[PDB]
Design a protein around this ligand. Sequence first.
Ligand SMILES: Cc1c2c(n3c1CCOc1cc(C(N)=O)ccc1-3)CC(C)(C)CC2=O
Length: 209
Amino acid sequence: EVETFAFQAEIAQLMSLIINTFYSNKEIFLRELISNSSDALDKIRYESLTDPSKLDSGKELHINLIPNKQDRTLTIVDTGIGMTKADLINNLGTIAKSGTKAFMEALQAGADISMIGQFGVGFYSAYLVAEKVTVITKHNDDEQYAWESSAGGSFTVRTDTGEPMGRGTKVILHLKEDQTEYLEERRIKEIVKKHSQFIGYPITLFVEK
Ligand SMILES: Cc1c2c(n3c1CCOc1cc(C(N)=O)ccc1-3)CC(C)(C)CC2=O
């Protein structure tokens, strides 16, 4: 069963601004998604100190960057804490509403789109390069879910039927026709070195063929 939900007004407004505003510094999307992955890895690592059984779903704490030219997708995989059904539909949207308001206020005041992460809504920077974003996630206290949105004011949530993940999040970016540079090895390496060189987890850039 595929469930369709309307984004809260502020989030729809944020997504429209990201999609329609002329802003050439699109590469910052990668540091934002890597930061979301790093925060999720920090959470599962901290939780495992008071409860070691929380690592039964996987001990390895890493980030994988998977480009696919055939499918025109860039996947950001992590073995972080993951997200529950409540996080995907309710919780994160509530936190994102207040963050969006502060960000849109800052933009009006003179701030730029690259400051998005300071407002905890960095995930949405994915729409600078992607026409569609698919989020596959598995949290210890819940089932494997697939969140998906091509913006337009709606998102879908379904129980995932694909390859079981163990624990973590996969952010699949269905790239815009003119944003294929983010599938090139040399371009991804450059971006990771420039904005994500001090991430406290191994970042593996998968190569194609
Ligand atoms: C806020 C927000 C939002 C999402 N994330 C965040 C910030 C903190 O939680 C996340 C964690 C990870 C991860 N790698 O574990 C990825 C994305 C997110 C994703 C969303 C629920 C589909 C939409 C949203 O509104």
